[PDB]
Design a protein around this ligand. Structure first.
Ligand SMILES: [Mg+2]
Ligand SMILES: [Mg+2]
Ligand SMILES: [Mg+2]
Ligand SMILES: [Mg+2]
Ligand SMILES: [Mg+2]
Ligand SMILES: [Mg+2]
Ligand SMILES: [Mg+2]
Ligand SMILES: [Mg+2]
Ligand SMILES: [Zn+2]
Ligand SMILES: [Zn+2]
Lengths: 24, 102, 98, 83, 70, 160, 91, 150
RNA sequence: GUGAAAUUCUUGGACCGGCGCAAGACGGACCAGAGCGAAAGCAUUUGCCAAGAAUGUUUUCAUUAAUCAAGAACGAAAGUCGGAGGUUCGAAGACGAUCAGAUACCGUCGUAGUUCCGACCAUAAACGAUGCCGACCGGCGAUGCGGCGGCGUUAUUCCCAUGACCCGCCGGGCAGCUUCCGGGAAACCAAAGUCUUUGGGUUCCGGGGGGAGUAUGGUUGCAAAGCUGAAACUUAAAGGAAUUGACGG
């Protein structure tokens, strides 16, 4: 991938991870 | 590798140069980077100068000129062949092409 | 240039010339006839300003309307309190020409 | 020139060089006697004076401060002090 | 030209116009042919002037900052 | 005009019509596009001034003047740029010698003296002591307000 | 010592009304209850009496001002504009 | 280079190699001292006193003609300023910038210059407290500095 | 309007031409390998307010300095919050085309935004991919500012001043050309030189490629996110500069 889009994908994944952890 | 010493633009002691829009595709180009052509063309064609002179109500009427400054991004400049790629040694000169007066 | 010049001349009237700060003492000095220049902040009450101007007209002494206020005139005098009216007994520094 | 004589530079380059970059520092300024017309006394004036020099016997200005050198008022004469 | 002649107009001043504004300033391909046809139709020609709208500065031109990608 | 220049245009708005004759009066003037574009050139500084000035008869005019720095005949330097203070002094000078040629006279003798652009000529003459200028003209003037349209004034402008 | 980290004057509202609303009302309450320097007597005794009314304790001068500040930026620009139009109107 | 600017200027004064008094100078040491006393009573800072003396009275160096520097002479007579000249001017500049800034809140350039000026003030004050020119407890307060200058 | 179209607007006068009005943006050409600013950045006129480099100085103080963990100010654009404003452009969205498909490139419309005020955020290929201070080491022609000196031309005036040119010198800058100074893997660099002939002072920072700027902890933020920041495991290369060939819608 383009590095910028890998960065965007990682940011989306990190928001999802934060939401999952906050749900607990 | 660094292709050009000036990085393809005239910005030397500046932080920021305001952008302009390419006359062909309306791309935002830094003003010092864009290719500028100042065309000064007869407002009538050289084929039609005689017809306009004959149809003129005046005798010594000087035909008006048309003064247009055109800005190009390098993409449109290369596609329109105003500029061409050059050899590694030939890139270094800045002398404009001759006007070919004769 | 006028404001900074008058501020510097006021600073040199302080520490080198005899002055007096305040309304009551200014009136007392004027009616003793030894006040040579009276400075009024633009913050001054209009009645007080008019009365001091009348006193100065009687005493044949000059009045300068400082382009500050009582706080800024206190700062120009170098004090940490507001002064609204002040008088100079003798400048010692050519603020008042001989 | 590998064999320039640094010890003994001729006065031409000694003068063209900057005041600090000379072999020994020398100021480019000087003092001048100034004569005001209609007056007898002589005023000693710095060539690069930053203040308006005035005569004490006449209410006339002798020089006006400029960027580099005091411009003498017209009609005034001047000579150097000991080169 | 024939309409002007039948309505009794003989000479014409000329005002050439391009799109102007923030858009292109070069006149289109039809200006030369239109003016040459007017001249060759018998109409007399007087003053000629460009009246293209030139902004002292305009609103943002359309196309985005990356231009018209083609 | 019989033999004047061709790059100067006048507006000449119509106020009154009588019989088969429409009658015009001054509304503004402008230089032509080609003349202005030919005057604008590189390696030189142009000074632009504008002034709102009222005539004696109540016509308010906005005047726009332009000037361009001139290179000397023996000049070797490519560019002829005026410094900012020089440009400011030139602009102030050419504003204050457009005011006084309008304030103290009527619209008729304002128009007849901007017909040869004598205002620009004296502006160029006056500014030579700061920086030489060559292409000095009153680039434009526009009418801002008009005084009530006195028909007698219109008729004396047309006839005698 | 420092008693609150960030709430300051809106610590009296406790946990109620929402953090953003308390933050919004905080600066308004601070300006409401602040003492301004009187422009007539020079003392810092000009405080709000009612909404829009600002009274000075010393010279007993009452001024019509803003709801929460002594003067509003709108009114300041208005005063400057009126002065400019007056000096343009007369000559 | 400059302390707080990216400038590397060289404009200085080139004191001549001849320390001797010129023969055309008729002013004696006491005469120059009296001139300095009169100018100091008039209120001139030592830099201005030197400038006036060099421009008008033709004296090249007060130290060369009298043997003492201008501040030394003023302090010996007992009329040297309470604050040093340069510190006083730095505080004056800081007060002026603060006065401008309290009306122009958007002047972030002025805020940056104010930070530079106050840093210079604190460094110079540290130097003077080290040299015991200033009291050991002397501190520059932005609120109360306005009454010290002008 | 486009490659061609079409969505769309149009006998209700669309487009076009003329005269006005209103609004909000934007300051073309002049505009440059020009200037200023710590950077970000800065271009209509005029006024006010403070600030500043360089220059000139036979002024003053006399080492007051350089770089700097922690801390602090500013910090494009996008984004967030509150209030105004909203012309144009235009994320999202809708539609028409193109296509095998077309959530796109092209076209029409259009929300947030783009504008101003106040408060956040602190990130950019925030670049010279190049720390600051100091010294030395080639030539040349220019350019910007300041100063100095000179044949002359020009502006008025009666002459010098003072401007505009011309010829030089000095200092501080933006740079450029050239060179077997020298360096470098080379591209190239008068600095990226004065380095095995290795030491001027000082700050930050890298240790094969991935995992990974990830997990977790802490901290900042309204949020988006910012700062600090692993390991398991995996891999024999990944990369840089140049040469030849092949290929290029
Ligand atoms: Mg490449
Ligand atoms: Mg940048
Ligand atoms: Mg293409
Ligand atoms: Mg921003
Ligand atoms: Mg908003
Ligand atoms: Mg649109
Ligand atoms: Mg170091
Ligand atoms: Mg590694
Ligand atoms: Zn293009
Ligand atoms: Zn009060």
């Amino acid at each position: 991938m383009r590095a910028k889009w890998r960065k965007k994908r990682m940011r989306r994944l990190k928001r999802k991870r934060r939401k999952m952890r906050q749900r607990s | 590798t660094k292709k050009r010493r000036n990085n393809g633009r005239a910005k030397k002691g500046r932080g920021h140069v305001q952008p302009i829009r390419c006359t062909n595709c309306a791309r935002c180009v830094p003003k010092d980077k864009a290719i500028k052509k100042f065309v000064i063309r007869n407002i009538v064609e050289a084929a039609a100068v005689r017809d306009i002179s004959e149809a003129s109500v005046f005798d010594a009427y000087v035909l008006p000129k048309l003064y247009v400054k055109l800005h190009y991004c390098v993409s449109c400049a290369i596609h329109s062949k105003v500029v061409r790629n050059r050899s590694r040694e030939a890139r270094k000169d800045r002398t404009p092409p001759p006007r070919f007066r004769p | 240039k006028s404001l900074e010049s008058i501020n510097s001349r006021l600073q040199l009237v302080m520490k080198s010339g005899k002055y007096v700060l305040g309304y009551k003492q200014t009136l007392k000095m004027i009616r003793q006839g030894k006040a040579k220049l009276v400075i009024l902040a633009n913050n001054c009450p209009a009645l007080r300003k008019s009365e001091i101007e009348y006193y100065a007209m009687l005493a044949k002494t000059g009045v300068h309307h400082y382009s500050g206020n009582n706080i800024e005139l206190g700062t120009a005098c170098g004090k940490y309190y507001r002064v609204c009216t002040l008088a100079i007994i003798d400048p010692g520094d050519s603020d008042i020409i001989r | 020139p590998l064999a320039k004589d640094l010890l003994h530079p001729s006065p031409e380059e000694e003068k063209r060089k900057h005041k600090k970059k000379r072999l020994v520092q020398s100021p480019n300024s000087y003092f001048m006697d100034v004569k005001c017309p209609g007056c007898y006394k002589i005023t000693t004036v710095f060539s690069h004076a930053q203040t308006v020099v005035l005569c004490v016997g006449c209410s006339t200005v002798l020089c006006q401060p400029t960027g580099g050198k005091a411009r003498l008022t017209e009609g005034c004469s001047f000579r150097r002090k000991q080169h | 030209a024939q309409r002007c002649k039948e309505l009794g107009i003989t000479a014409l001043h000329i005002k050439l116009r391009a799109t102007g504004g923030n858009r292109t300033k070069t006149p289109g391909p039809g200006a030369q042919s239109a003016l040459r046809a007017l001249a060759r139709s018998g109409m007399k020609i007087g003053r000629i002037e460009d009246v293209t709208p030139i902004p002292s500065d305009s609103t943002r031109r359309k196309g985005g900052r990356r231009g018209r990608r083609l | 005009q019989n033999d004047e220049v061709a790059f100067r245009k006048f507006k000449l708005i119509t106020e009154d019509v009588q019989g088969k004759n429409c009658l015009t009066n001054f509304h503004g003037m402008d230089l032509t596009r080609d003349k202005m574009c030919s005057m604008v050139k590189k390696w030189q500084t142009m000074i632009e001034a504008h002034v709102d000035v009222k005539t004696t008869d109540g016509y308010l005019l906005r005047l726009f003047c332009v000037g361009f720095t001139k290179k000397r005949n023996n000049q070797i330097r490519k560019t002829s740029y005026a410094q900012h203070q020089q440009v400011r002094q030139i602009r102030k000078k050419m504003m204050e010698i457009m005011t006084r040629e309008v304030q103290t006279n009527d619209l008729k003798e304002v128009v007849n003296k901007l017909i040869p652009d004598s205002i620009g000529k004296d502006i160029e003459k006056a500014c030579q002591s700061i920086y030489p200028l060559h292409d000095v003209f009153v680039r434009k003037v526009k009418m801002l307000k008009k005084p009530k349209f006195e028909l007698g004034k219109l008729m004396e402008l047309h006839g005698e | 010592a420092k008693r609150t980290k960030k709430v300051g004057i809106v610590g009296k509202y406790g946990t109620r009304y929402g953090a953003s609303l308390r933050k919004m009302v905080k600066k308004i309450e601070i300006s409401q209850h602040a003492k301004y320097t009187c422009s007539f007597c020079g003392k810092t005794k000009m405080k709000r009496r009612a909404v829009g009314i600002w009274h000075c304790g010393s010279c007993m001068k009452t001024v019509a001002g803003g709801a929460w500040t002594y003067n509003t930026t709108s009114a300041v620009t208005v005063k400057s504009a009126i002065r400019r139009l007056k000096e343009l109107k007369d000559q | 280079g400059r302390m707080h600017a990216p400038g590397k200027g060289l404009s200085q004064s080139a004191l001549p190699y001849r320390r001797s008094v010129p023969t055309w100078l008729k002013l004696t040491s006491d005469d120059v001292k009296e001139q300095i006393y009169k100018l100091a009573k008039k209120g001139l800072t030592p830099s201005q006193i030197g400038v006036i003396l060099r421009d008008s009275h033709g004296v090249a160096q007060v130290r060369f003609v009298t043997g003492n520097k201008i501040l030394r002479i003023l302090k010996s007579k007992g009329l040297a300023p309470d604050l040093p000249e340069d510190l006083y001017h730095l505080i004056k500049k800081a007060v002026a910038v603060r006065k401008h800034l309290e009306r122009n809140r958007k002047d972030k350039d002025a805020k940056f210059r104010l930070i530079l000026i106050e840093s210079r003030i604190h460094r110079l004050a540290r130097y003077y407290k080290t040299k015991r020119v200033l009291p050991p407890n002397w501190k520059y307060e932005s609120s109360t500095a306005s009454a010290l200058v002008a």
